[PDB]
């Protein structure tokens, strides 16, 4: 529901990201329903899962290398995480592959935290990830139809591209 400007964009995004990161952290191929993101949530969660897994599984060695290199364990670490995420777009090129990589990275860290039973840090992490990720790309996301444009881009293989 529109209250300020792009309130809907944040909620839909947060729900999907929170769901995706928490889901993957369990280690199983589960998929829980959204409370607000019905159409966008299911379309985006399904795509984000397929893409997020493909990205992190392919560059798994690189992800794990950074995962072991990262000293992330508390709420203070999110400052660096948010900085790294925005740093990826420092050249001004907001490519989807970079955006999803940051999400797959978040999921990778979510799993790392869940593996040691530190869910208490996963919630604030997923929140910071969604907040900073969207905050620094508001206009770009709203102009790109949000998750609608996101799913279509990764569906050009053989689903809804042509």
């Amino acid at each position: 529901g529109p209250l300020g400007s792009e309130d809907d964009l944040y909620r839909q995004s947060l729900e999907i990201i929170s769901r995706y990161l928490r889901e993957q952290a369990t280690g199983s191929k589960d998929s829980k329903p959204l409370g607000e993101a019905g159409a966008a949530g299911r379309r985006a969660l399904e795509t984000l899962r397929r893409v997020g897994d493909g990205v992190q599984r392919n560059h798994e060695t690189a992800f794990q290398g950074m995962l072991r290199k990262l000293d992330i364990k508390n709420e203070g670490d999110v400052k660096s995480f948010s900085r790294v995420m925005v740093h990826v777009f420092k050249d001004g090129v907001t490519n989807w592959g970079r955006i999803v990589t940051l999400i797959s990275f978040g999921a990778f860290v979510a799993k790392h935290l869940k593996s040691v039973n530190q869910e208490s840090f996963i919630e604030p992490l997923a929140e910071t990830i969604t907040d900073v990720l969207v905050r620094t790309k508001r206009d770009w996301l709203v102009k790109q139809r949000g998750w609608d444009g996101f799913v279509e881009f990764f569906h050009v293989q053989d689903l809804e591209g042509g």
Partner: peptide, 27 residues
């Protein structure tokens, strides 16, 4: 006990390659 900004570069390079991999279909 420190944050070496290699993740930023690594993730950046990964994103570029990933984007180029998803944009180009099996054609």
């Amino acid at each position: 006990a420190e944050l070496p900004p290699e993740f930023a570069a690594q993730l950046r390079k990964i994103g570029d390659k990933v984007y180029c991999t998803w944009s180009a279909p099996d054609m």
